[PDB]
Design an enzyme around this catalytic site. Structure first.
Site, mmCIF file in Angstrom:
data_model
loop_
_atom_site.group_PDB
_atom_site.id
_atom_site.type_symbol
_atom_site.label_atom_id
_atom_site.label_comp_id
_atom_site.label_asym_id
_atom_site.label_seq_id
_atom_site.Cartn_x
_atom_site.Cartn_y
_atom_site.Cartn_z
ATOM 1 N N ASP A 179 7.306 4.234 -0.179
ATOM 2 C CA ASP A 179 6.121 3.141 -0.010
ATOM 3 C C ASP A 179 5.637 2.807 -1.468
ATOM 4 O O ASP A 179 5.285 3.912 -2.080
ATOM 5 C CB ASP A 179 5.070 3.711 0.950
ATOM 6 C CG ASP A 179 4.168 2.363 1.339
ATOM 7 O OD1 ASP A 179 4.239 1.403 0.893
ATOM 8 O OD2 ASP A 179 3.446 2.626 2.253
ATOM 9 N N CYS A 213 8.498 -3.892 5.940
ATOM 10 C CA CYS A 213 8.158 -2.338 5.701
ATOM 11 C C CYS A 213 7.105 -2.058 6.369
ATOM 12 O O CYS A 213 6.883 -2.325 7.671
ATOM 13 C CB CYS A 213 7.908 -2.219 4.262
ATOM 14 S SG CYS A 213 6.902 -3.799 3.385
ATOM 15 N N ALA A 215 3.641 -2.937 5.648
ATOM 16 C CA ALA A 215 2.582 -4.131 5.485
ATOM 17 C C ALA A 215 3.415 -5.706 5.678
ATOM 18 O O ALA A 215 2.789 -6.517 5.728
ATOM 19 C CB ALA A 215 2.175 -3.983 4.181
ATOM 20 N N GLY A 216 4.683 -5.623 5.361
ATOM 21 C CA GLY A 216 5.303 -6.549 5.127
ATOM 22 C C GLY A 216 5.241 -7.575 3.929
ATOM 23 O O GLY A 216 5.215 -8.684 3.666
ATOM 24 N N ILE A 217 4.952 -6.740 2.685
ATOM 25 C CA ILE A 217 4.673 -7.473 1.396
ATOM 26 C C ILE A 217 5.312 -6.655 0.317
ATOM 27 O O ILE A 217 5.966 -7.556 -0.454
ATOM 28 C CB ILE A 217 3.074 -7.649 1.534
ATOM 29 C CG1 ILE A 217 2.239 -6.463 1.514
ATOM 30 C CG2 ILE A 217 2.599 -8.622 2.293
ATOM 31 C CD1 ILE A 217 0.833 -6.669 1.109
ATOM 32 N N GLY A 218 5.142 -5.468 0.138
ATOM 33 C CA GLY A 218 5.599 -4.813 -1.220
ATOM 34 C C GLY A 218 7.238 -4.626 -1.300
ATOM 35 O O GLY A 218 7.937 -5.484 -1.909
ATOM 36 N N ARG A 219 7.727 -3.767 -0.255
ATOM 37 C CA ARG A 219 9.298 -3.420 -0.450
ATOM 38 C C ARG A 219 9.891 -4.773 0.185
ATOM 39 O O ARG A 219 10.976 -5.177 -0.313
ATOM 40 C CB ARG A 219 9.543 -2.163 0.516
ATOM 41 C CG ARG A 219 8.933 -0.783 -0.224
ATOM 42 C CD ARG A 219 9.224 0.206 0.791
ATOM 43 N NE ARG A 219 8.120 0.244 1.576
ATOM 44 C CZ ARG A 219 8.018 1.519 2.242
ATOM 45 N NH1 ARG A 219 8.711 2.601 2.283
ATOM 46 N NH2 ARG A 219 6.872 1.595 2.939
ATOM 47 N N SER A 220 9.331 -5.510 1.575
ATOM 48 C CA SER A 220 9.882 -6.675 1.890
ATOM 49 C C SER A 220 10.086 -7.791 0.784
ATOM 50 O O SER A 220 10.965 -8.501 0.800
ATOM 51 C CB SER A 220 9.149 -6.980 3.020
ATOM 52 O OG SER A 220 8.732 -6.323 3.920
ATOM 53 N N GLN A 260 4.169 -5.319 -4.541
ATOM 54 C CA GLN A 260 2.948 -4.654 -4.597
ATOM 55 C C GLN A 260 2.785 -3.907 -6.188
ATOM 56 O O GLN A 260 1.565 -3.764 -6.189
ATOM 57 C CB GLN A 260 2.969 -3.692 -3.309
ATOM 58 C CG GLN A 260 2.534 -4.490 -2.241
ATOM 59 C CD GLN A 260 1.052 -4.941 -2.455
ATOM 60 O OE1 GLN A 260 0.051 -3.778 -2.575
ATOM 61 N NE2 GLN A 260 0.472 -6.291 -2.392
HETATM 62 O O1 LIG Z 1 5.371 -0.742 3.033
HETATM 63 C C1 LIG Z 1 5.112 -1.354 1.926
HETATM 64 O O2 LIG Z 1 6.360 -1.759 1.056
HETATM 65 C C2 LIG Z 1 3.901 -2.264 1.485
HETATM 66 O O3 LIG Z 1 3.772 -3.236 1.248
HETATM 67 N N1 LIG Z 1 2.811 -1.370 2.107
HETATM 68 C C3 LIG Z 1 1.470 -1.672 1.815
HETATM 69 S S1 LIG Z 1 1.132 -3.018 1.050
HETATM 70 C C4 LIG Z 1 -0.547 -2.639 1.199
HETATM 71 C C5 LIG Z 1 -0.808 -1.154 1.772
HETATM 72 C C6 LIG Z 1 0.509 -0.964 2.129
HETATM 73 C C7 LIG Z 1 0.867 0.406 3.040
HETATM 74 O O4 LIG Z 1 2.057 0.601 3.288
HETATM 75 O O5 LIG Z 1 0.009 1.337 2.744
HETATM 76 C C8 LIG Z 1 -2.075 -0.635 2.192
HETATM 77 C C9 LIG Z 1 -2.938 -1.600 2.105
HETATM 78 S S2 LIG Z 1 -3.281 -2.428 0.536
HETATM 79 C C10 LIG Z 1 -1.640 -3.288 0.481
#
Ligand SMILES: O=C(O)C(=O)Nc1sc2c(c1C(=O)O)CCSC2
Length: 296
Positions: A179, A213, A215-220, A260
């Site tokens: 993550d 992933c 959150a659906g943002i960083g890894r995805s 992310q």
């Molecule tokens: O799973 C990822 O790749 C990802 O974007 N995760 C995210 S993006 C995000 C968070 C997380 C998490 O898992 O804690 C925590 C809240 S701020 C933005």
């Protein structure tokens, strides 16, 4: 991208570039996400789908899921990006896969990471123990699975219990991408991307692939940015006309805050620059990634 890459690296400017992308990115309302009734449908208070590209469930009660359609028009590929399902929204997730006609689910995280339950166990880990999701009337069974050292491929059977129609879903599970982290290497990530590609699940006869992933943002975001840069390049066979930061900005029209950290941005340049060797006609690089990745 490759001259660009070494100008960035050379002058240590990945966080400022990343920062800059962050300041340029869109912002559209997420009013349905934030309705009080949807509070328990979101994993993270600050990660919501914009209303204009959110997936609606085909159900009258409450149509909300935390998921967006990333429609990449030029590339002509769409993906659904979604959070890791919650314990009350696994039946919505599967309702979404069925209604959207997706063939593939790409999972880039583990259920447990850094000591926390980053996602529901939304699929059966064994063939004799199907899941029935009673709120959306759907059954899912593990048909089999192929476990490699850093990923597993599962074949699932999804039954719509209301018609008894059945579909096969392939699940591509990357288990060693941390993550807020990056893949171990461009090779192993590329080896993973090309397993998904070869399977056909990205193919336009199918609904959009579902990528998640936690959150659906960083890894995805990272997965999709690489895929699409490589598709773009392929359609023209012209590497030099792909603007990676500009493709990430286009994707950020459809879901907030795709990719992310600045090292994920930087890894995406690595991934696309390496992947180009293959797109531009050197198929041997593919079986090289495969060796490097130590998949067995
Ligand atoms: O799973 C990822 O790749 C990802 O974007 N995760 C995210 S993006 C995000 C968070 C997380 C998490 O898992 O804690 C925590 C809240 S701020 C933005």
């Amino acid at each position: 991208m490759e001259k660009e890459f070494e100008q960035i690296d050379k002058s240590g400017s990945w966080a400022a570039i990343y920062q800059d992308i962050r300041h340029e990115a869109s912002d559209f309302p997420c009013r349905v996400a934030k309705l009080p009734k949807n509070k328990n449908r979101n994993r993270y208070v600050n990660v919501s789908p914009f209303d204009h590209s959110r997936i609606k469930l085909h159900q009258e009660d409450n149509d909300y899921i935390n998921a967006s359609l990333i429609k990449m028009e030029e590339a002509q590929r769409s993906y659904i990006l979604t959070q890791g399902p919650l314990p009350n929204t696994c039946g919505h997730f599967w309702e979404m896969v069925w209604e959207q006609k997706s063939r593939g689910v790409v999972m880039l995280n583990r259920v447990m990471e850094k000591g926390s339950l980053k996602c529901a166990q939304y699929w059966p880990q064994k063939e004799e123990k199907e899941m029935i999701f009673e709120d959306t009337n759907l059954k899912l069974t593990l048909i089999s699975e192929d476990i490699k050292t850093y990923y597993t491929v599962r074949q699932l059977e999804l039954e719509n219990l209301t018609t008894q129609e059945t579909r096969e879903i392939l699940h591509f599970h990357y288990t060693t991408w941390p993550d807020f982290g990056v893949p171990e290497s461009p090779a192993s990530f590329l080896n993973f991307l090309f397993k998904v590609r070869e399977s056909g699940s990205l193919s336009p006869e199918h609904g959009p692939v579902v990528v998640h992933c936690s959150a659906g943002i960083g890894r995805s975001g990272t997965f999709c940015l690489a895929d699409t840069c490589l598709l773009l390049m392929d359609k023209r066979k012209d590497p030099s006309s792909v603007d990676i930061k500009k493709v990430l900005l286009d994707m950020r029209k459809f879901r907030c805050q795709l990719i992310q950290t600045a090292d994920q941005l930087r890894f995406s340049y690595l991934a696309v620059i390496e992947g180009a060797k293959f797109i531009m006609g050197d198929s041997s690089v593919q079986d090289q990634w495969k060796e490097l990745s130590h998949e067995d």
